[model samples]
Target: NNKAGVTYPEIKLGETGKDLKATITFFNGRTDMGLASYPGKNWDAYIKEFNAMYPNITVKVQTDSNYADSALTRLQANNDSWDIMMIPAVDRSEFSNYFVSYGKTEDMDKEIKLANEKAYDGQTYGVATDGQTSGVVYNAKVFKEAGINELPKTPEEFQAALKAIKEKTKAVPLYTNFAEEWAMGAWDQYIGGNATGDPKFMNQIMPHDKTPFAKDDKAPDTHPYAVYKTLYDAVANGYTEEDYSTTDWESSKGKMNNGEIATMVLGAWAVPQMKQAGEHADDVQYMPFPITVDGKQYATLAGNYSMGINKNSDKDRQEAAMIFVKWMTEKSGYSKNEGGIPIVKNDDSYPDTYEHFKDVELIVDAPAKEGEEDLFADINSDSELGINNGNGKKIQDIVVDAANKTKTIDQIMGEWDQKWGKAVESE
Candidate 1:
């Protein structure tokens, strides 16, 4: 039986190795990639690379249409159906305690150079693979047509730019994927995080840790309520589509490509996806999130995928998983996959699309100067800081629910604080 409570018969290596096999199951929720199908050639190539790294370990990837909620349900039920999985930064905090740590970050630093000190947590629970950050993606042609000369740097200026686009061309100012449950939360992470300068406030609300925004709330000022308020204001003032509540992600992509929508707050990864989606790829340009505070421009939450071992596995299997994870994070392994950027230091075989953007490098390399605090320090303190156990999911849920009008920002923040406060207190 494995440590996680799954049973398996053991077989000797070499002579009996042919029958000795380990199955690594992955739960990939709502990802562009599927087990049998994937979004583009990049994803397909990445799968192949994984296969090449571990030929003996058979990887069975299971996907669901409603990935996040379904995966959470499965994990909450303590179902050992998956050995390894891809989880967002927010989900990490609520779910990671159910899993086992791979090792310590001191061991990992020897393997991969953490780009940001705040991204590490001293324990190697997971290893980050490729990373993405949120920002504004605009259509160059539409920008020129609307007579918008420069990118806005503040909230007021940003609203004016969107208004100008609407006045000149009647194009939707933003294309939001409200139909997709996770899409509504993008604004909170991109704009709200920028406004408040702290992303962990959302985490504090989840697991009912503390009362977010309460007079005694010790949670950071970057509360989910603040993010939700900004989103409600945008929607109330007509900065987004009128039918935003019903817009599907698929349709939004088409509108954005056709110039029906003027802008979208998405990740750096979207640049490649947009390019592949249509011939309008050249029309898209990347810009930082418009909301800035105290001369600091916060990028959307930066995170990556990581691989860890199942603690219950035998020594051979554990060693194999570790070796495979290391291989995948290395430069040579990253080159095998077309879309991913290597997490290892001094390795520069990232995709051309990634290399083309200067903002990505700036954000990833942005460090805390003397007498200045690193805003992402809390989340980036360790390689696993924002992983499945890091309190990101609670924040995501609170902000998403607020944006959808399912709950008030204050109510959401209150619930978030209570949930996360208990969780952190217990820890």
Candidate 2:
């Protein structure tokens, strides 16, 4: 048995037998570019790479169309099928119980250290692959046409800008992915975290904050409803598109690229997608999510991709998996992929994408040095800040569902509190 107390069946190096065969499977959530990059590509390239690395092992990568949450449900039901799985930090907490940390506790401690130096539960459950930080993507041409010289830094200014954009362009002032559950969740945490300025508050409330949203009328204030109410009001007041509810993400991207839409609430990663959608790559710019309370400009969520091994795998396979994971996460490997930020130690090989937003790096790096507790506190306190340390899937889903329906913000919060409370409390 290894240090994790799981058995590692022995296999001699270079041994070639039927028993020596190992297959690694990965489930990719995002279907568009995530799975083999625009599809139509065969596994030959990846297969060749894996086989070259380990002549004794083979890899089988499959993708699921279901979003992250559904994929987790499937993973929980069938654990052994996946040797290495792809997961977002938001969904990490819910699934961590099943996957094996990629390396020995000491080795993990020495290696993966970003955001927080400490590993999850003192063991690395997943190594971050790529990340997407939330922000507002606006069309420069549209803003210029509206006579808006500056991006709004406060809620009031933001509202005014939206109104002006509507008046001048006669177009939808904002394009939000309300139809996508993940997008809605990103917006919620973006605003909610900003409003409460307390990331731990929601976690504390889970299973019951020892106080309910109703008992303390002020409880609802802890969420970002105040900010969302503005967008909700815009939609209700005829300031947005009539078919807003039905507009899917891909369609919105096309509209934004065509200048039919003025602004979009999305992450930094969406920059490339938007660029691909239109000829206005240079016209697209990233701004802070509208300042909600206290004139704060911050990102509500920081989305990341993580990879972990299956604990049930034998020692040799586990070691091989670790080698693969480490290679992928290391600075050299990560630099090859432009979409994500490396979770490994700082290296000069940082991707060119780092230059786009020099400010974000300063903010992310500063508080991270303090420790995980402080990092968590910072994320919770600032609505603009979100980390993938635990399961934010349910919280994100409930908030999105509530926002789209006719339910009051209070009702939404109540439902979220109750449902999450029961989920965490149950055996």
Candidate 3:
């Protein structure tokens, strides 16, 4: 069990594409994390297998679970420690010059899913991790027991479903892992593009749209009201966990898998985790963030991390790095193992929870316009709202406020509206 032992030894690129032969240095900002049984270790296991075929392609791997700070330090220093880099949540524009561009119609573009997740100006600068989407992961069995076969379409219908679950079953109707901190932020994801049924809602509209959060007569059913109302009503009506401040993430999954809990607002990645947490894998279900738009359900497509090649690497290493990235995206079993929506196209192996989206529209927000890519992001930062921080301070306040019964949802919305206006005006 060497720390640097080769992971994914079964991956091989065969004699196709480039006849790459170089000992590339890989700076992996990731580690062995799959569903309970993660296959990759902190080494070049997948790359090791590449050497088996190429023979001369030696890849030396260095891993760091603490990525952002460590990777950024070296990157800012112009240190070419990584021929191929694996990092997440990077500022694409700031570091755009440091990586190579995978062309718009290049062979790699067609081979991977979410190719544009990290692209800028029609050039794929960084390739994101498995393509995944977020929504409400519920218990199909619980819904059936509660006589609720159909997914909730309207905000009123969602509350009715929760009420039915509470009355008819022993399950906690909605298990908000509030004490766990991050779970509260799950609602934030839907409020952006998912809630509006407009992919550009977050990027194009939210920044300048004067009444973005207000109930829209145009698309009334799918706006932020549907989401925040459900949360407030669920908590106020005694549908969520009994103890809002103490519910934890570790037990939330098991509770749902075991049918003790009916639903949770999470991503497809939680599907496996909940299944592994309990014996009832069949009971766990995933569906859209329960907002029907013009009678159609919609969910937001999310991209987690991205990989880039070092601009300072030598010719041989550069060529090999491209091969390594291409291999990771198209070849290695990264997509399936991550329990996320596959980044590769035509892959029907999405989790059972997403089966509900068969006829439903899967919404992918438009990436911010060029030069305005950071428009919403800068506002999110300047407002200090940290809305997308995933279980951060902004979401924390909501859950805590609900627990204390101090701030009404309207008050919170008003605060956000004011803060967002300031952010836009400041820009």
lDDT by candidate, in order shown: 0.52, 0.53, 0.69
Question: What is the overall TM-score of model 2 with all chains considered together?
Answer: 0.69
Question: Taking the candidates one at a time, how many backbone clashes does each contain?
Answer: 38, 11, 6
On residues 52-133, what C-alpha lDDT tens digit does candidate 1 reach at each position?
5455766666767655567567655665566555543433332236444544546555555452332233344566666555
**What lDDT does candidate 2 reach at residue 370?**
24
Using Cα atoms with residue i matched to residue i, what is each candidate's TM-score against the true structure?
0.67, 0.69, 0.79
Summarize candidate 3's per-residue lDDT along 1-427 as a digit string, tens digits: 1111112122245644246567777775544341224422224556556666566777777776445456766677786778777653455455566776655524445666666666666667666667777777888999999999898866778889999999999999988877654466667778866677789887787776545556666766668866776787788777888887687776787899989999898877677768766778888878777777776767777765667777787766665666666576666656665566666655656645467778777767876766787677777777776655443556667666776799987788778778878888888
Candidate 2 regions exceeding 4 Å error are: 1-22, 34-59, 88-96, 103-110, 114-120, 191-223, 292-296, 300-303, 314-316, 331-339, 347-427
lDDT of 3: 0.69
2 against 3, candidate with superior lDDT: 3
TM-score leader: 3
| Model 1 segments more than 4 A misplaced | 1-23, 35-39, 42-44, 52-54, 77-80, 88-97, 113-121, 191-193, 196-230, 305-320, 331-341, 345-427
